[PDB]
Design a protein around this nucleic acid. Structure first.
Lengths: 86, 156, 192, 135, 158, 131
RNA sequence: CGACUUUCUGGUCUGUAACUGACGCUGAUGUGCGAAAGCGUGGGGAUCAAACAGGAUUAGAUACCCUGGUAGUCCACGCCGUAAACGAUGAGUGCUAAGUGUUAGGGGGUUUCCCGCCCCUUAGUGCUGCAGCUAACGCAUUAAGCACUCCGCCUGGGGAGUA
RNA sequence: CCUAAUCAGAAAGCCACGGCUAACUACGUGCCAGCAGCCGCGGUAAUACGUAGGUGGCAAGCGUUAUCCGGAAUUAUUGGGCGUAAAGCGCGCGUAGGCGGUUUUUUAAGUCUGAUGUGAAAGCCCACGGCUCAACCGUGGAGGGUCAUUGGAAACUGGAAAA
RNA sequence: UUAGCUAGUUGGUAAGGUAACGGCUUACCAAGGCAACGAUGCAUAGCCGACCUGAGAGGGUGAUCGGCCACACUGGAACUG
C-alpha cells in the first residue's frame, strides 16, 4: 500500500515515555471565519518508534500504517532531524 | 404609619359597607419610590364580579377623595379576592372541601413538600382529596401535623 | 382589490386620463385640499401607473422586482414590463379606451394569445407573439367599435383593423408609452 | 481591539431578553418540563380580579386580575377595554402588552372571544376586539 | 445658476428670555440647479415666508459644480462631518438614486439618475446634509487628474 | 517599533500633503525605491531619488503638487499592515476609483501596479491604496 | 515618592556608534509592587480619633455645641491589594505649521565663561495656535492629526458592584 | 382544462385618517368616559371618544400577537469608542504568543499561479421548457472547497543561509 | 461562577477476540496518559446539506426533502442470520 502515501507528517518528537512508542507533534494553523489571522496549532501523534530511538526535538516524518494502540496510529517513516541541545 | 393606616381602615370601612356593603378584611400598603399601593381586600360575596370591583373602587376612591389625613396621594389597590386562602385553621380547610388546596407537609416527596389536590370530602387531619400529581389520581390522607404550609388553591 | 375605483373620481385625485377633476373629491376635495409628499408622490406614481393599469400588488410588485436582474436599466425595464404587462399594450393598440375597458375583455378572455385561450389579465406578451379575437364572438359591439377608434399603433405594436391582432416588435420606452413620470421615483418607492 | 485578541474572542453582541416572559405550554403538561413555547395564546383562567386606582388628573380607573394560563404561572394583569361579563375564576385570554397604567405587569387581556366579552357597538371591533363585523 | 430652493424643515427654537419665550422659526434651505450645482443656506425667522426668504438668499450665494458622468459622479466616495457621515456610490441606470430622504433631496438638487447611497451616523438632517455637501465638494473627474498627473485618460482612468 | 514601512511612508506622505511641500526624503528599502519610481511614473511625485547610507539609503522624493500646490491624488492608505498579510489573486485585484485610483501589488516576481496587476494577471500581496 | 545624612543598589539623559547583528515588540495565563482605613498578632501611643460618656440640647441626647478620652492611627509582619491609585488620555513606533517655555544636554558661530546670544536637534514637561478631529469642550510635535504590533474595558438608565 | 348558455348579475372585505405614514371633516360626547405603538390627546369644541359622511391604504383577505434579521453599523473586520455621555489594571515583571529593521541568495512553505481529481442531488443564480400565466417542477448552465495534487514564481511573510 | 482529568488508564509483553485494529479484554512489567491553544464538568443539542432576514457582509434558523447518526415501556443480555 506504499503507492498510497498513507499519512506522512514532518514534525518533532516530543516524548517517548511509552514502550516502543513516541509522539510526533505536527503543526498546522486554521483560518478565522470573520478575521484571517491565526496562530500555529497542532495535533500530537502517538507514533511507534520501532525501538524508541527517537529523541526530543527530533524533527521527523511518519506514516499512518495501523491503529497501533490508543491513538497510536502513525508508523515512523524516517527520522529526519533527531537532535539534542544545539 | 401602621396606626395611621389602621385609622384609615376604620374611617373607610364605613363606606365599603354603606356603598357596596362589602367588608375590608384588611388594607395593606406596599411602596417602591412612589405613591404607595394600599391593597384593600374587599370582601362581601366571594365571587366578586369585575364591575363589583369597578363600582366599589369608585365608591372607596370618592370616599377618600376628600379623606386623606396622610399628606401625600397614593395608589388605592381595590382588591376583591377570590376563595383562594392560606389554610392555617381547620375551618379554613373545612370551607375549602369544595375547592382544591395545596399543602407543604413535614414528609415531602422528591425534596419539596408542596402538593396540590382537589378535595372530595372533609376528614379532620386525614385527607380524601382527589390529589392530582403527575397526572395521578388518588385520595391521599395528608397529616396536618406534617403540614408546615397549607393554602387553598385555584380551581382552574 | 382588483379594480374597484370609479377612476374618474380617482383621476380627480391623480389628475390622470384613463370641473371637480381639477380638485380632489369628497367633502373638502373641491375646497382647498392638502399638498403632496415625496413619499406621497411616489405612492401617486404607483397609482398613476397601476391604478392606471388596473391591477393589484400581488400581481404587481413581483413584476416590479423582476426588472432589476437584467443589465442596464431597471426603471425602463419596469416600463417595458408594464408594457409587456398584458393590458397596457392592448390599450395602446386602441383596443381599449381605458385600461379598465379591456381588462374585462382579457379576464373574460375573448383575447386568444396567438389563438390560444389565456383569460388572465395578468398574462405576459413578448416579441414575436400576438393575440386572437375568439372568432366565435370576435365582432361584438364594443370590441369592433374600439377597433374603429385606434389613435395610433406604436413601433412595438403591429396591428391593422383587418389584422385583428398586434404583435410585439421592439422593447418600448417611456418615450413610447405616454405620461412620463419618474421611473426612478417609483423604484425608490419600493426601495424603502 | 487588536487582531489577535479579536481572534481569541467572539466580540459578543448585547442580545436582549424578551421582556414578555411568554413561556407557553411547551412541556408544562407532561413532566412539567420548562419549555420556551412562543405561542401567541394559551388558554387559562383569571382566578382573581381587582382594580387599582390611577392618580389625578386622569382618574381613568383601570382594573386588574391575576391569571393562570396553560402553564399556570402567577401574574397580576390589568384589563383594558369597556364592558365585560366575567368574574372571579373565569377563563380569559391574555395578550402581551405593557401600558402606562402600572408597573409590575407587561401583559393584557383581550376582549371578545372569551369570558371577557367585548362590545360590538363600535366599528373598530370590525376585525378585532374579538367581536364579529358589526352587522 | 437657476436657483431652486430646498428647505428641510421648520424648527421653532424657543430662545426663552427673561419673561417671554421667543421661539424663532428656523429653517435651512438648500439652493441648487439640479444640473450640476447646489448650495445650502440657513435662516432663523418667525414664519415660513421669512425663513424661506432668508435661507434661500443665503443658499443661492455659495454653490458647487457637481462633476458628473451619465449625470452621475465618475467615482464613488463617502461624506463625513461631525459623525453625520454618509456614503455614496454610482448605480446602474434605471435603478434610481437611493438615499435617506433629506440627503436624497440634496442629491436630486444635484440631479443624479442612479446612486448607491445611505445615510449614516447622525440622523440630524443638518449634520448629514453637511457631510453630503462636503463629499459633493470633494468630487473630481478623470480629465482633472489626466491634466494634474502628467499621464492622461484611457490609461489610468475610470 | 517601526513595524511597517508602508505605514510610515504613507502617513508622512499625507503629512506632506497637509503641509503642501514637495522635497522630502526618507530611509528607503529596495521596495521603497521601486515604488517611488512607480510614483514618478504616476507623476504626482515630480521626482524621486535614492542613495545609500545607514542603514538603507535615504529615498528622496520631490512631489508633483497641483498647479496651486494641491494634491493631484486625493487619498492614500496602506493595505498590507502588520499581522494583516493580505493577498489578492488575479481576480481578487481591486480597483480603487477604477483606473484613477491605483495600487501597487507585490507579486510572485515583484511589486506591480494595479494596471500591471489586472494586465499580467498575476495576483499577490496587495500593498497600499492611493487615490 | 520631599527634615538631613548614609546603605547599595534601581533608574535618568547629553553626547556615544564603539559594532555582534534584530538580538525587537506589547504582552492572555501567571504574576510583583503597591493611599487610607480596617485588622491578626506582638509593642508603642505623641497627637488625632471614631465610637463613647460626662454633657448642652431635650422625656431621650451619645444627636453638636462641649470635656476628656477613645479602637486604631502609630512601631513588626501578614491580612490587607482597595480608592478620586483620575487625565476614566495602555505602551512603543515614527510623521506632521507655527509661535513659544521649561528640565537637564550638547554643538556651532557669536563673545571675556555666549554663561552671557542665537540657533540645531537630544529627551521629556508647558501656554497660544496650522492642519486635523471632537456634539461640544480642546488638543494640536508632549495631538485628542496621522498611521502601525500588542492589553483591557465598555452593550441605556438603573436595577445591583449588589446578589 | 375546455365548449352551449347565465346576468352584472352570486363573489370582498377590512385597516387607517392628529401626525409619525395614506387619508378629514361634521356631529354627539365630556380630562370623564376613555383612546392609547410614540409624541400624548379627550376638560364639553376630539379629523387622538363615539357616530355619520368623506378620503385614503388595502383585499381574498385584513388587523393583532409570538419570534429572526434588516433597521440593528445596536459589534464597531467590513462597520465605536475610552478628552469628558459606557469603558485604561493602580501600576509592574514578564511565559507563550502577536507582529516583525537594512541588504544578498535558495525555498515555494506560504504567497501568488494555472492544470488535475473533486465538490450528491435538489434548492442555489442564469437561461430555458412545460403547465393560460403565475405558482410550479423540469432542463442545462452558472455558481458551489478554507479539499488534495502538480505547473511556474520568489515580491512579500515564513523559513534556509549571508552579512 | 466548568481546571485538573487521569489507571485498562499509558505503552508494550503473551493469550484470546472480532473484518481488522489495539486494553479490545485478560495476566505481566512499567508508569504513565491527557491539563488553560479550556482537558475535565455542567447545560443543552440530533447532524449537515439546506433555509429566513440582511445590498452584501453577516446574523439567525435546521418544517417536509437528501443523506448521516441515535432510539424504539425500562434495564440486562444473547439466538438467528
Amino acid at each position: 500500500s506504499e503507492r498510497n502515501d498513507r499519512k506522512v507528517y514532518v514534525g518533532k518528537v516530543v516524548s517517548d515515555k511509552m514502550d516502543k512508542t513516541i509522539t510526533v507533534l505536527v503543526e498546522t494553523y486554521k483560518t478565522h471565519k470573520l478575521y484571517g489571522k491565526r496562530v500555529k496549532y497542532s495535533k500530537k501523534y502517538k507514533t511507534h518508534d520501532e525501538n524508541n530511538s527517537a529523541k526530543l526535538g527530533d524533527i521527523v516524518k511518519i506514516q499512518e500504517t495501523r491503529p497501533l494502540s490508543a491513538t497510536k496510529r502513525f508508523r515512523l517513516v524516517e527520522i529526519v532531524e533527531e537532535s539534542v541541545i544545539i | 404609619m401602621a396606626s395611621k393606616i389602621t385609622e384609615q381602615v376604620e374611617v373607610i370601612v364605613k363606606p365599603i359597607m354603606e356603598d357596596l356593603n362589602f367588608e375590608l378584611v384588611d388594607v395593606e400598603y406596599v411602596k417602591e419610590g412612589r405613591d404607595h399601593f394600599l391593597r384593600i381586600s374587599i370582601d362581601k360575596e366571594g365571587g366578586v364580579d369585575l364591575n363589583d370591583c369597578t363600582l366599589a373602587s369608585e365608591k372607596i376612591s370618592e370616599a377618600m377623595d376628600a379623606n386623606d389625613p396622610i399628606p401625600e396621594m397614593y395608589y388605592l389597590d381595590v382588591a376583591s379576592p377570590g376563595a383562594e386562602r392560606p389554610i392555617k385553621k381547620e375551618q379554613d380547610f373545612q370551607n375549602a372541601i369544595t375547592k382544591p388546596v395545596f399543602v407543604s407537609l413535614y414528609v415531602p416527596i422528591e425534596g419539596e413538600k408542596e402538593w396540590l389536590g382537589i378535595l372530595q370530602e372533609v376528614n379532620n387531619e386525614t385527607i380524601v382529596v382527589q390529589v392530582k400529581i403527575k397526572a395521578r389520581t388518588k385520595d391521599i390522607e395528608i397529616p396536618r401535623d406534617k403540614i408546615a404550609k397549607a393554602r387553598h388553591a385555584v380551581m382552574i | 382589490a382588483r379594480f374597484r375605483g370609479s377612476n374618474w373620481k380617482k383621476s380627480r385625485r391623480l389628475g390622470i386620463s384613463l370641473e371637480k377633476r381639477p380638485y380632489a373629491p369628497g367633502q373638502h376635495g373641491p375646497n382647498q385640499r392638502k399638498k403632496l409628499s415625496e413619499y406621497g408622490l411616489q405612492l401617486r406614481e404607483k397609482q398613476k401607473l397601476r391604478y392606471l393599469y388596473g391591477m393589484t400588488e400581488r400581481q404587481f410588485r413581483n413584476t416590479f422586482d423582476i426588472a432589476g436582474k437584467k443589465f442596464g436599466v431597471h426603471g425602463e425595464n419596469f416600463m417595458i414590463l408594464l408594457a409587456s404587462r398584458l393590458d397596457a399594450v392592448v390599450y395602446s393598440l386602441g383596443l381599449a379606451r381605458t385600461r379598465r375597458q379591456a381588462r374585462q375583455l382579457v379576464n373574460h378572455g375573448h383575447i386568444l394569445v396567438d389563438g390560444k385561450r389565456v383569460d388572465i389579465p395578468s398574462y405576459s406578451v413578448k416579441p414575436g407573439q400576438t393575440i386572437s379575437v375568439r372568432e366565435k364572438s370576435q365582432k361584438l359591439n364594443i370590441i369592433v367599435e374600439s377597433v374603429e377608434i385606434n389613435n395610433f399603433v406604436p413601433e412595438y405594436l403591429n396591428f391593422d383593423a383587418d389584422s385583428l391582432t398586434g404583435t410585439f416588435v421592439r422593447l418600448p420606452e417611456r418615450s413610447e408609452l405616454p405620461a412620463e413620470i419618474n421611473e426612478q421615483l417609483i423604484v425608490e418607492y419600493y426601495s424603502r | 481591539p487588536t487582531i489577535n485578541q479579536l481572534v481569541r474572542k467572539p466580540r459578543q453582541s448585547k442580545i436582549k431578553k424578551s421582556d414578555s416572559p411568554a413561556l407557553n405550554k411547551g412541556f408544562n403538561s407532561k413532566k412539567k418540563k420548562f419549555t420556551d413555547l412562543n405561542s401567541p395564546q394559551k388558554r387559562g383562567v383569571c382566578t382573581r380580579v381587582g382594580t387599582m386606582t390611577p392618580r389625578k388628573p386622569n382618574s381613568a380607573l383601570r382594573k386588574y386580575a391575576r391569571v393562570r394560563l396553560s402553564n399556570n404561572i402567577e401574574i397580576n394583569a390589568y384589563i383594558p377595554g369597556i364592558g365585560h361579563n366575567l368574574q372571579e375564576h373565569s377563563v380569559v385570554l391574555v395578550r402581551g402588552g405593557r401600558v402606562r397604567d402600572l408597573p409590575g405587569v407587561r401583559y393584557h387581556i383581550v376582549r371578545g372571544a372569551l369570558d371577557t366579552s367585548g362590545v360590538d357597538g363600535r366599528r373598530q371591533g370590525r376585525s378585532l376586539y374579538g367581536t364579529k363585523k358589526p352587522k | 445658476k437657476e436657483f431652486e430652493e430646498r428647505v428641510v424643515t421648520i424648527n421653532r427654537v424657543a430662545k426663552v428670555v427673561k419673561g417671554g419665550r421667543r421661539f424663532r422659526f428656523t429653517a435651512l434651505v438648500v439652493v441648487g440647479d439640479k444640473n450640476g450645482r447646489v448650495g445650502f443656506g440657513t435662516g432663523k425667522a418667525q414664519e415660513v415666508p421669512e425663513a424661506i426668504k432668508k435661507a434661500v438668499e443665503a443658499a443661492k450665494k455659495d454653490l458647487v459644480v457637481v462633476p458628473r458622468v451619465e449625470g452621475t459622479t465618475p467615482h464613488t466616495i463617502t461624506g463625513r462631518y461631525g459623525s453625520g457621515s454618509v456614503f455614496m456610490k454610482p448605480a446602474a441606470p434605471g435603478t434610481g438614486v437611493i438615499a435617506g430622504g433629506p440627503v436624497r433631496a440634496v442629491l436630486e438638487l444635484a440631479g443624479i439618475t442612479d446612486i448607491l447611497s445611505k445615510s449614516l451616523g447622525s440622523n440630524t438632517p443638518i449634520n448629514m446634509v453637511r457631510a453630503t455637501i462636503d463629499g459633493l465638494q470633494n468630487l473630481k473627474n478623470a480629465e482633472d487628474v489626466a491634466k494634474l498627473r502628467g499621464k492622461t485618460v484611457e490609461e489610468l482612468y475610470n | 517599533t517601526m513595524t511597517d514601512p508602508i505605514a510610515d511612508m504613507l502617513t508622512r506622505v499625507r503629512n506632506a500633503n497637509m503641509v503642501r511641500h514637495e522635497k522630502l526624503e526618507l530611509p528607503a528599502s529596495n521596495i521603497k525605491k521601486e515604488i517611488a519610481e512607480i510614483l514618478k511614473s504616476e507623476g504626482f511625485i515630480k521626482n524621486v531619488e535614492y542613495v545609500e547610507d545607514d542603514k538603507q539609503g535615504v529615498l528622496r522624493l520631490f512631489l508633483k503638487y497641483g498647479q496651486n500646490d494641491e494634491r493631484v491624488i486625493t487619498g492614500l492608505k496602506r493595505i498590507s499592515k502588520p499581522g494583516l498579510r493580505v493577498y489578492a489573486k488575479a481576480s481578487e485585484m481591486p480597483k480603487v476609483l477604477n483606473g484613477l485610483g491605483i495600487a501597487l501589488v507585490s507579486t510572485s516576481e515583484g511589486v506591480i501596479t494595479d494596471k500591471e496587476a489586472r494586465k499580467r494577471n498575476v495576483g499577490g500581496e496587495i500593498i497600499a491604496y492611493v487615490w
